[PDB]
From a paper:
report the characterization of 4 highly potent NAbs: F4, F6, F7, and F9. The structures of these 5 complexes are almost indistinguishable. that these NAbs prevent [name] attachment to the permissive 2BS cell surface. binds to the BC loop of [name] and the BC loop of [name].
Interaction between F6 Fab and [name] capsid proteins. BC loop, EF loop, C terminal of a [name], and BC loop from another [name]. involved in the interactions with F6 Fab are shown as sticks.
Residue numbers in the entry:
A (entry chain B), D (entry chain B): 5 to 220
B (entry chain C): 51 to 246
C (entry chain A): 3 to 29, 40 to 272
E (entry chain B): 112 to 167
F (entry chain A): 94 to 272
The structure:
């Protein structure tokens, strides 16, 4: 008595997010393998979320002048909403996902010539620009800019939100928001440049993605 | 033959005016050892680079090119630039890529002031083919044969802040150097000036 | 699991080459007493399709009568087969012929009889060749034959014309110097010079005119001719041991196997 | 003699793909951390390329009839080009990348009622549908469909291409291609359904991504 | 070689040790010589050591 | 490639040097690959290789010889009759061959100089003396019978006993003239 083997019928086959149970199974054919190359035509690392989510995106840039008086709101920029944009690399990770958890890394770059004087402030503001004081904004994790010491600072801020995760397609309220008040007025002499440059870079830290959607 | 390759040789020249908008494209670099644009009137000679003479006697070229951008500012010329390498071939519409769209690609920033003035930009070997043919030897475009592994736009990342008792512009030399360079399939070809 | 998935119906990658050595040798009855389980089976299951077949009581066939294995490629294609033929007519005429592995290239302009069937049996191709040509006709002609890789410039293929390429382009790349009287024979390696990795046999579009071809040999003559006698060359290609084959393909029909 | 510490000036700071050297440095502020939740509002795993690239995409579906005679080309479908599409989840990984290396996992699903008879064939064809024989297509890694044994098969095929990697924005030629010839004609009786259903699922295996681009 | 810039000027100079001739070799390839590069930003005095390069 | 030359009458003596000067425009001097390569560096020391090809009329019994610097030889780049005696030619060193027997020469060029090394780009009297190192001159005989041109062409090659010194800036795209 010799038994001839047959084909399997019922099995749990499919992805963790793409699951379909078949009543008639078949062995999937596979020839070859993932052949390694001693000669690679490109010299980079392979792409991942670790190198696509953690990369600075220029979300905003301005130009601060002399005519801006004290505590004038130069820029009112939203953090995550400008990150969720088609012209950046994180759109390929945020279009196919709905609910997320992440940390925000802000880096702000300005450039004074040292014949100018003055000061700028960038603050990471959650919720609202409500009746809280402008002269009390140092309680926020912020940055202070000066025409004397340095011109590039970077800010690490966490996820500050009421619910569990953030909805991109219909948010309750924006998680973070940055503002630029004139911390000290831009004073020059004759022939000195009456302006300075301004850049706002941003990236994600510790990114989590959940809730895949088929629609756009 | 590694003598005339790793030593940085001037391949191009471009200034940086203060009267330009942030994100305006200054000069692209077609990333290949074949690139040079200088000449001379006394003597009448088209200025080759020492790397452009080595690789022009071959069909294929391969290596991690190290561009060295030596700016010539004062200590007080402030601002930053963007050297954004965009890979592929010698011909894509990279001029239509916006500045924030160019923040998607890997790149680097450099403050014009500081204690140094030369950035060594090690270009990765990013090509569909493991080498790249001397299509300049031929005279016809064809999808599959190319010249460069990509292009490299110098952007205006920040404005040039400076007083009036210094200059309003900072010139940037483009040195041409490399590392791990390999060429094969020898020939004879005299390269022509890339007229940008 | 590596990908976090599952598989229920037994079906995987198929048609791995080299199942068996084709020379006949002994590894008694093969079948008989035991009932044949290998006759009836499921071809829709590839594991059940890989069962040892039998239908009858059989025994050992024996050994073969030639030690030379006539079923390995490295000793089968050692016999050199036709590529092209061409004649010269006037002074310093430069001839140019490619090696175009495309099956669209009907003979003579392309692959003839044995090369068109064989080099369209498989998808990918990598390695050097051998070329054997014969000088036939008028004697005392001092010509020159050279190889040109892809990417570099060369004259127009399948056209006998005057040379528009200088000798410093010809001496730097590599050629040979010979007269028809001294040795009268060339058996040459064809160098694998490409920035691309491998070449194909049957493609479409701009990939067919670029990724199928790999090399080209072009010839200019001199001292041809004195008192009128035709000089005829003919190209026969042969194989070497540093080439390897990839992705066995369905062979061509009886229609495109055109013979010359 | 007591020395007062200062701020750093020159350092290599920035991402591996997004690199900018500053001449004036600043210490990046970071408060809080990535707080773990004993109560998660969603019960899924976090999203990754391992669960977004390895998920079956319905790239094609047809309906094979009785009137299709022997070896009739029912479907002529391209594999990777239909995978590179906006309405799928891999568009978020293939839009921000240009050169790739990957393996193809095909799964084909049909459904016969067992009063129908006939056969179908699906073959993974690289390069061309050139002068190679239709009756020799079993040399390809393929699938054979039957109205007797089974109705779902899956096929694993490698990357078959001349150059090193695949260009999405301007390909040389398509890497893979599937065809459906009528392997045996659909014969029914009176009142039996004169048709059968057909589905083509596809996903990537061992995905590599290189060459980020800023443009679309 | 000794030069002296005030740091409100900008520009650059090059001094190269050239044997034989100022022939058809490139001006943009002169970094293969043992040379010096002058700048209005970093330094103003450099020194060059070169050997005896001669046929006889 | 180095040069090419044809014979026209009986016992014509041809003379060609090996002039490493970049001033020497081709044909009279360095052509395409030799002019770029041997003006990449300042100093040059070592022996060469020369490969020539006999092309044209057959059964011509000629003679090819080397002459060092300092010693007398006929006028370069000039096809003329030989003014040098055979005892000067047999004592220094030559070869004897017919066009029919082997039809090929692959020869070492001997490094014969009282000076040490040679240069690529000089000026004045140093250019006409310290750049050149050697010279090969050829006289034929039995050329010719029934009129057929005999053409020679010189191709230079390299050996392993030469060494390079002082890497130099390469030449422009203008003086790299091809033949």
């Amino acid at each position: 008595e010799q038994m001839i083997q047959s084909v399997d019928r019922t099995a749990v086959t499919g992805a963790s997010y793409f699951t379909s149970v078949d009543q008639s199974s078949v062995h999937t054919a596979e020839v070859g393998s993932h052949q390694i190359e001693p000669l690679k035509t490109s010299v980079d690392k392979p792409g991942s979320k670790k190198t696509q989510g953690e990369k600075f995106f220029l979300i905003h840039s301005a130009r601060w002048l002399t005519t801006h008086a004290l505590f004038h709101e130069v820029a009112k920029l939203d953090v995550v909403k400008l990150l969720y944009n088609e012209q950046f690399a994180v759109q390929g990770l945020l279009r196919y996902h709905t609910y997320a958890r992440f940390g925000i890394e802000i880096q702000v770059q300005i450039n004074p010539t040292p014949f100018q004087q003055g000061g700028l402030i960038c603050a990471m503001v959650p919720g609202d620009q409500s009746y809280g004081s402008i002269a009390s904004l140092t309680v926020y994790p912020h940055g202070l800019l000066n025409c004397n010491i340095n011109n590039v600072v970077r800010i690490k801020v966490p996820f500050i939100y009421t619910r569990g995760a953030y909805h991109f397609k219909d948010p309750q309220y924006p998680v973070w928001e940055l503002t630029i008040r004139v911390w000290s007025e831009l004073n020059i002499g004759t022939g000195t440049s009456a302006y300075t440059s301004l850049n706002v870079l941003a990236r994600f830290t510790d990114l989590e993605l959940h809730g895949l959607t088929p629609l756009s | 033959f590694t003598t005339w390759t790793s030593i940085p040789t001037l391949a191009a020249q471009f200034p940086f005016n203060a009267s330009d908008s942030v994100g305006q494209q200054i000069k692209v670099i077609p990333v290949d050892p074949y690139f040079f644009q200088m000449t001379n009137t006394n003597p009448d000679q088209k200025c080759i680079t020492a790397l452009a003479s080595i690789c022009q006697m071959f069909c294929f070229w391969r290596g991690d090119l190290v561009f060295d951008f030596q700016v010539f500012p004062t200590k007080y010329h402030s601002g930053r630039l963007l050297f954004c390498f965009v890979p592929g071939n010698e011909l894509i519409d990279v001029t239509g890529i916006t500045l924030k769209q160019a923040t998607t690609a890997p790149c680097a920033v450099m403050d014009i002031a500081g204690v140094q003035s030369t950035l060594r930009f090690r270009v990765p070997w990013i090509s569909d083919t493991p080498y790249r043919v001397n299509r300049y030897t031929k005279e016809a475009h064809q999808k599959g044969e190319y010249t460069a592994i990509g292009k490299l736009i110098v952007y205006c990342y920040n404005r040039l802040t400076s007083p009036s008792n210094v200059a309003h512009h900072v010139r940037v030399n483009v040195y041409l150097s490399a590392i791990n360079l390999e060429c094969f399939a020898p020939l004879y070809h005299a390269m022509d000036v890339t007229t940008q | 699991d590596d990908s976090g998935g599952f598989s229920t119906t037994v079906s995987t990658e198929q048609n791995v080459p080299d199942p068996q050595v084709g020379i006949t040798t002994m590894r008694m009855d093969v079948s008989g007493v035991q009932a044949p389980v290998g006759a009836i089976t499921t071809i829709e299951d590839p594991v059940l399709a890989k069962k040892v077949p039998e239908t009858f009581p059989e025994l050992k066939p024996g050994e073969s009568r030639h030690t030379s294995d006539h079923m390995s490629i490295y000793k089968f294609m050692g016999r050199s087969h036709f590529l092209c033929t061409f004649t010269f007519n006037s002074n310093n005429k430069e001839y140019t012929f490619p090696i175009t592995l495309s099956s669209t290239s009907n003979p003579p302009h392309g692959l003839p009889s044995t090369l068109r069937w064989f080099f369209n049996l498989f998808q990918l191709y990598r390695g050097p060749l051998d070329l054997t040509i014969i000088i036939t006709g008028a004697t005392d002609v001092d010509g020159m034959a050279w190889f040109t890789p892809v990417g570099l410039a060369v004259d127009t293929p399948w056209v006998e014309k005057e040379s528009a390429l200088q000798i410093d382009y010809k001496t730097a790349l590599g050629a040979v110097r010979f007269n028809t009287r001294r040795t009268g024979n060339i058996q040459i390696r064809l160098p694998w010079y490409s920035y691309l990795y491998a070449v194909s046999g049957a493609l479409d579009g701009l990939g067919d005119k670029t990724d199928s071809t790999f090399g080209l040999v072009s010839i200019q003559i001199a001292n041809y001719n004195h008192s009128d006698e035709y000089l005829s060359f003919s190209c026969y290609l042969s194989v070497t041991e540093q080439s390897e084959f990839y992705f066995p393909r369905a062979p061509l029909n009886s229609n495109a196997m055109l013979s010359t």
